[PDB]
Design a protein around this ligand. Structure first.
Ligand SMILES: N#Cc1cc(Br)ccc1O
Ligand SMILES: N#Cc1cc(Br)ccc1O
Length: 129
């Protein structure tokens, strides 16, 4: 893509420690799956393309970008050590949306719908075994 967009977050790095846990399996098979098919998922399924959207300030404002396409790759590629890393990626994605956009904007309402589902599913995150 455009040189004006940053490289996406890392999804592969042999130096980084990782492991599978039952909680990470639940984050892929239940949490990500549920959110990915929501009617309002599409803006969040890949990094924000600030060039295409004519938002030249986006990566001036949002210095820790995250998206569900990145999270999907990180889960499928076993990038994470623990559930907390992955949950933090989701939280970063939501908070970027809420800091960049005005309350009540369409993308905000879309993010809020995904967040409500997310919180329901994370309340049920299984005990680590
Ligand atoms: N595991 C799983 C899963 C995740 C996404 Br996103 C879509 C379909 C699936 O079956
Ligand atoms: N945040 C954000 C954002 C994402 C898409 Br896709 C389009 C416009 C936006 O302002």
């Amino acid at each position: 893509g455009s040189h004006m967009n940053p490289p996406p977050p890392e999804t592969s790095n042999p130096n980084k420690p990782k492991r599978q846990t039952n909680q990470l399996q639940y984050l892929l098979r239940v949490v990500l799956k549920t959110l990915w098919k929501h009617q309002f998922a599409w803006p969040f399924q890949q990094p924000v393309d600030a060039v295409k959207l004519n938002l030249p300030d986006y990566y001036k404002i949002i210095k820790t970008p995250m998206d569900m396409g990145t999270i999907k790759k990180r889960l499928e590629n076993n990038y994470y050590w623990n559930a907390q890393e992955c949950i933090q990626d989701f939280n970063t994605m939501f908070t970027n949306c809420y800091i960049y956009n005005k309350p009540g904007d369409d993308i905000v309402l879309m993010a809020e719908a995904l967040e409500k589902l997310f919180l329901q599913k994370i309340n049920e995150l299984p005990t680590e075994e």
